């Protein structure tokens, strides 16, 4: 289908591209109760979550959420420049739907 993150964002409702061109400032991770998630920030203060697996997610997304938390952690610990995040702007903080790195 889509060949880039911007075009893939255009397929879904309630989404927007954030352009960072910057490494992740911090990585939070929680195994607590109903908050099995990860949060990341950048130097500009911008904050993003990978969502708790829930009823908003179809079954094929289950594995892809676990992969995204794997991706953020290694990007943080190798200082990889992240280009964009396509997110869902109808949640607080914005829920990562995708990531690109260049």
């Amino acid at each position: 289908t889509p060949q880039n993150i911007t075009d893939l964002c255009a397929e879904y409702h309630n989404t927007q591209i954030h352009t960072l061109n910057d490494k992740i400032f911090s990585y939070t991770e929680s195994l607590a109760g109903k908050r099995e998630m990860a949060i990341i920030t950048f130097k500009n203060g911008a904050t993003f979550q990978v969502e708790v697996p829930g009823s908003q997610h179809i079954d094929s997304q289950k594995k892809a959420i676990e992969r995204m938390k794997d991706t953020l952690r290694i990007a943080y610990l190798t200082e990889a420049k992240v280009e964009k995040l396509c997110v869902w702007n109808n949640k607080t903080p914005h829920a990562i739907a995708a990531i690109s790195m260049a």
Partner: protein, 224 residues
């Protein structure tokens, strides 16, 4: 801290990636033997390279300093680079270690035992036909938080690796006399070699740990 060192070199960033850093003469890969001698390294004449013989590659304390040395050696080059480098315990103030017998004190240079690994290189300016370019290309292999928490080696760690001949008066003076390898002053040349090999073994262990742990931080156990 986050201080940088600078070095003009003809070898481009493509070659540096494949070499695992900016190497000494004869060393092809960082983790791959060769003479390692600080005294012989600093005396070595610069023939088309900034000093990189006898186990060390040399650097400059500033950008201005690296650029003027780059125009004395690599003026012929239509394209050479000035590498920005992080300070770390592989690195040695040559004027402090060798002391009064520092061959070129005015140059104020700092030399990396075993080459400068790729990940220690912050970035590089291009230098098109004598002219320094403003834009600084940033190395993806660089790890800012790791190397900004390290400094150069203190002279105390380097006095024993100084590498003077056994009949040299340095070994019977201070501060080198309390650090002399067995056989030096009062088997020296082989004992400074092996001390230099162990030093590079233990520093290489430290950069493998940082870089190869980053590479394995994607592992997820719960997915079989």
């Amino acid at each position: 801290n986050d201080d940088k060192l600078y070095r003009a070199d003809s070898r481009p960033p493509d070659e540096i990636k494949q070499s695992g850093g900016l190497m000494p003469r004869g060393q092809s890969e960082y983790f791959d033997q060769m003479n390692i001698n600080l005294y012989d390294h600093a005396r070595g004449t610069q023939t088309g390279f900034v000093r990189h013989d006898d186990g060390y590659v040399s650097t400059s304390i500033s950008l201005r300093s690296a650029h003027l040395v780059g125009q004395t050696i690599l003026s012929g080059h239509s394209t050479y680079y000035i590498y920005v480098i992080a300070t770390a315990p592989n690195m040695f103030n040559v004027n402090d270690v060798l002391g009064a017998y520092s061959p070129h004190p005015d140059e104020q240079e700092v030399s990396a035992l075993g080459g400068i690994p790729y990940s220690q290189i912050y970035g590089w300016y291009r230098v098109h036909f004598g002219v320094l370019d403003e834009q600084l290309h940033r190395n993806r292999g660089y790890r800012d938080r790791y190397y900004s928490n390290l400094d150069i080696a203190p002279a105390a760690d380097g006095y024993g690796l100084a590498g003077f001949p056994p009949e040299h008066r340095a070994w019977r003076e201070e501060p080198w006399i309390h650090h002399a390898p067995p056989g030096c002053g009062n088997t020296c040349d082989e004992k400074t070699q092996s001390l230099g090999v162990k030093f590079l073994d233990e520093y290489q262990s430290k950069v493998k740990r940082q870089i190869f742990s980053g590479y394995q931080s994607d592992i997820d156990t719960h997915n079989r």
